[PDB]
């Protein structure tokens, strides 16, 4: 089966270099072009260039001439993207995608017909920190909302569950927001019956693997 499997996510500091690999299986790498596509968060797709898989020659789109290098590792059936001198603006997902070589009269699609799953690169000078978890206490004034504010952590992601996963209905866990500190914050809320507030215990379970931080925070009406 035709597959392009890319390397996993990377967290880098400005000025560093990253190498993204794209392993071809189920087809002969050397028979197709290989393209690189960038998607910044917010989701525009931008073609960065391609590498001639037969000769090894790379061709860069103009906005990507300088700090980008396409390479082949044929004995590993792998194509690679290296970004040097990373900037915060390089924070994006990078896709590799193959395209059948064009020749007059061909029957193949001249399209990027199989894509890798994408490699997310995050560039930041922030240092790793576990979150503080604060209650969003249900109002004392039907349906009530409560939640947890998971503040000041790096890097993404955190996982939030309620009552160890026994509470899923009415839960909304919001996208993280990047603060000017360089640290992330997110909120998780759930709506419950107002009548349940005096009798049901509500606990948000927060896990931040990069910092080995786990927190079980009970959220209760404030006295």
């Amino acid at each position: 089966q035709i597959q392009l499997v890319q390397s996993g996510p990377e967290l880098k500091k400005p000025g560093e270099t990253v190498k993204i690999s794209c392993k071809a299986s189920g087809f002969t790498l050397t028979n197709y072009g290989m393209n690189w596509v960038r998607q910044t968060p917010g989701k525009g797709l931008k073609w960065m260039g391609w590498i001639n898989t037969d000769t090894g020659e790379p061709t860069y789109a103009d906005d990507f001439k300088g700090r980008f290098a396409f390479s082949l590792e044929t004995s590993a059936s792998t194509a690679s993207l290296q970004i040097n001198n990373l900037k915060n603006a390089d924070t994006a997902t990078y896709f590799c995608a193959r395209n059948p070589p064009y020749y007059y009269g061909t029957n193949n699609a001249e399209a990027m017909d199989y894509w890798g799953q994408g490699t997310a690169v995050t560039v930041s000078s922030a240092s790793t920190k576990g979150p503080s978890v604060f209650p969003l206490a249900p109002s004392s004034k039907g349906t009530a909302a409560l939640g947890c504010l998971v503040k000041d952590y790096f890097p993404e992601p955190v996982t939030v569950s309620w009552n160890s996963g026994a509470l899923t209905s009415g839960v909304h866990t919001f996208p993280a927001v990047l603060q000017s500190s360089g640290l992330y914050s997110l909120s998780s809320v759930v709506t419950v019956p107002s009548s349940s507030l005096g009798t049901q215990t509500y606990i948000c379970n927060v896990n931040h693997k990069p910092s080995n931080t786990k927190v079980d925070k009970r959220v209760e009406p404030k006295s």
């Binding site: 525009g44 260039g49 995608a97 017909d113 894509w115 799953q117 109002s139 504010l149 909304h172 909120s187």
Partner: protein, 213 residues
């Protein structure tokens, strides 16, 4: 560089609908146009190549047509797995260029937000910071507006917001906004309020609290 334009960035539709997505090019591309689908999970596949040829394994409900500078992708009987973002892409010349993408969402009846405000916790305040949270829950359509007021002064620049993706069960959106103050600033004022407007609300909804009550 040939510019590709998808005039409609967001399109609401119902399951079963016929849905059309337009794409315009800044010059004649002689039908050298491909269509890609990106799922919410981020994975990409080609749907159509050379304006109207279905790629292998793409179901027959997808089709495309056009010429010159005007092109379109059509889904004849929309299904749940088709809720995604569709991009066009020219290959008439280098650099290959993409349109801005058209993200599908499910249509439903208008739903007004339920609004909730949350004071900062005593634990956070001890640390020197106060986060005030306003929740706009389960509304439709996605467009909503809110204003933070502190002792009736409109606050602009000291809050951040985020919005969920469309809910899989009720097709609504939720929004969370966080107002951040220093402890000393938080204690200088009394009334903290979030005021919300939405096409589902016949008049604005204000939720507020008095610090320390």
């Amino acid at each position: 560089d040939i510019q590709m334009t998808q005039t409609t960035s967001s399109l609401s539709a119902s399951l079963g609908d016929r849905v059309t997505i337009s794409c315009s090019s800044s010059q004649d591309i002689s039908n050298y146009l491909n269509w890609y689908q990106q799922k919410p999970d981020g994975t990409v596949k080609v749907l159509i190549y050379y304006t109207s040829t279905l790629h292998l394994g793409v179901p027959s409900r997808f089709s495309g047509s056009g010429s010159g500078t005007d092109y379109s992708l059509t889904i004849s009987n929309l299904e749940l797995e088709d809720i995604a973002t569709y991009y066009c892409q020219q290959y008439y010349n280098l650099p290959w260029t993409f349109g801005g993408g058209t993200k599908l969402e499910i249509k439903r009846t208008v739903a007004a937000p339920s609004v909730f405000i949350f004071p900062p916790s005593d634990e956070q305040l001890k640390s020197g910071t106060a986060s005030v949270v306003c929740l706009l829950n389960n509304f439709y359509p996605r467009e909503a507006k809110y204003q933070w007021k502190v002792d009736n002064a409109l606050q602009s620049g000291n809050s951040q917001e985020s919005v969920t993706e469309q809910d899989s069960k009720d097709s609504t959106y939720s929004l969370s906004s966080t107002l951040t103050l220093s402890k000393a600033d938080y204690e200088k004022h009394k009334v903290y309020a979030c005021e919300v407007t939405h096409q589902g609300l016949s008049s604005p909804v204000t939720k507020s609290f008095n610090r320390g009550e």
